[PDB]
Write a protein that holds these residues in place. Sequence first.
Motif, PDB file in Angstrom:
ATOM      1  N   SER A 283     -29.511  77.626  78.911  1.00 42.47           N
ATOM      2  CA  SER A 283     -29.709  77.300  77.507  1.00 42.47           C
ATOM      3  C   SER A 283     -30.514  78.414  76.863  1.00 42.47           C
ATOM      4  CB  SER A 283     -30.421  75.958  77.334  1.00 42.47           C
ATOM      5  OG  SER A 283     -31.816  76.099  77.521  1.00 42.47           O
ATOM      6  N   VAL A 284     -30.222  78.687  75.594  1.00 41.04           N
ATOM      7  CA  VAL A 284     -30.847  79.780  74.863  1.00 41.04           C
ATOM      8  C   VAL A 284     -31.542  79.216  73.631  1.00 41.04           C
ATOM      9  CG1 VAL A 284     -28.661  80.313  73.710  1.00 41.04           C
ATOM     10  CG2 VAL A 284     -30.482  81.992  73.688  1.00 41.04           C
ATOM     11  N   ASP A 285     -32.772  79.666  73.394  1.00 40.90           N
ATOM     12  CA  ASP A 285     -33.447  79.425  72.129  1.00 40.90           C
ATOM     13  C   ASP A 285     -32.933  80.438  71.117  1.00 40.90           C
ATOM     14  OD1 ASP A 285     -35.080  78.318  70.266  1.00 40.90           O
ATOM     15  OD2 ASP A 285     -36.952  79.110  71.078  1.00 40.90           O
ATOM     16  N   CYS A 286     -32.316  79.947  70.044  1.00 42.46           N
ATOM     17  CA  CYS A 286     -31.655  80.843  69.103  1.00 42.46           C
ATOM     18  C   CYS A 286     -32.662  81.623  68.268  1.00 42.46           C
ATOM     19  CB  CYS A 286     -30.716  80.041  68.209  1.00 42.46           C
ATOM     20  SG  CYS A 286     -29.536  81.016  67.275  1.00 42.46           S
ATOM     21  N   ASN A 287     -33.686  80.943  67.748  1.00 42.89           N
ATOM     22  CA  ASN A 287     -34.670  81.603  66.895  1.00 42.89           C
ATOM     23  C   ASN A 287     -35.456  82.660  67.656  1.00 42.89           C
ATOM     24  OD1 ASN A 287     -36.247  82.219  64.691  1.00 42.89           O
ATOM     25  ND2 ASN A 287     -37.589  80.441  64.913  1.00 42.89           N
ATOM     26  N   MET A 288     -35.818  82.377  68.906  1.00 44.76           N
ATOM     27  CA  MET A 288     -36.562  83.354  69.692  1.00 44.76           C
ATOM     28  C   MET A 288     -35.694  84.531  70.112  1.00 44.76           C
ATOM     29  SD  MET A 288     -38.686  82.898  73.233  1.00 44.76           S
ATOM     30  CE  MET A 288     -39.654  81.469  72.794  1.00 44.76           C
ATOM     31  N   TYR A 289     -34.395  84.314  70.311  1.00 49.34           N
ATOM     32  CA  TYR A 289     -33.519  85.417  70.685  1.00 49.34           C
ATOM     33  C   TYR A 289     -33.208  86.328  69.504  1.00 49.34           C
ATOM     34  CZ  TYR A 289     -29.340  87.927  72.131  1.00 49.34           C
ATOM     35  OH  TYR A 289     -28.413  88.902  72.394  1.00 49.34           O
ATOM     36  N   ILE A 290     -32.918  85.763  68.331  1.00 49.03           N
ATOM     37  CA  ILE A 290     -32.569  86.594  67.179  1.00 49.03           C
ATOM     38  C   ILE A 290     -33.812  87.249  66.590  1.00 49.03           C
ATOM     39  CG2 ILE A 290     -31.330  86.682  65.010  1.00 49.03           C
ATOM     40  CD1 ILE A 290     -29.453  85.797  67.022  1.00 49.03           C
ATOM     41  N   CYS A 291     -34.762  86.439  66.130  1.00 51.90           N
ATOM     42  CA  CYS A 291     -35.960  86.915  65.437  1.00 51.90           C
ATOM     43  C   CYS A 291     -37.193  86.492  66.226  1.00 51.90           C
ATOM     44  CB  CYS A 291     -36.015  86.371  64.015  1.00 51.90           C
ATOM     45  SG  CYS A 291     -34.492  86.539  63.077  1.00 51.90           S
ATOM     46  N   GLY A 292     -37.604  87.319  67.180  1.00 51.49           N
ATOM     47  CA  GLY A 292     -38.681  86.934  68.070  1.00 51.49           C
ATOM     48  C   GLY A 292     -40.063  87.019  67.456  1.00 51.49           C
TER      49      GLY A 292
END
Lengths: 49, 49
Positions: free
Chosen positions: A15-24
């Motif tokens: 599973s991926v955290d979207c907010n942390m991956y795009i805009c960390g």
Amino acid sequence: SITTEVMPVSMAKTSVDCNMYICGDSTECANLLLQYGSFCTQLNRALSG
Amino acid sequence: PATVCGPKLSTDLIKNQCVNFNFNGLTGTGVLTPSSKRFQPFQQFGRDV
């Protein structure tokens, strides 16, 4: 005679955290990620499935 | 290492706390810990993959 046969059953659950991956940890990018709304929920739904 | 840059006052270090740092014009966000890493004599920041 005894014959072996190997079959895969499951793979790794990820599973991926979207907010942390795009805009960390960036607030200016996190306000600009809301403009692409409902684009990470539609993705985490697939990964949870 | 930097030679010429503008008039901003310096602030004491805050460690183990979610802060906004500014090191030689590198704006960011994260928590700060003492490091055991080794740099070159001229290097200023380190990157990842």
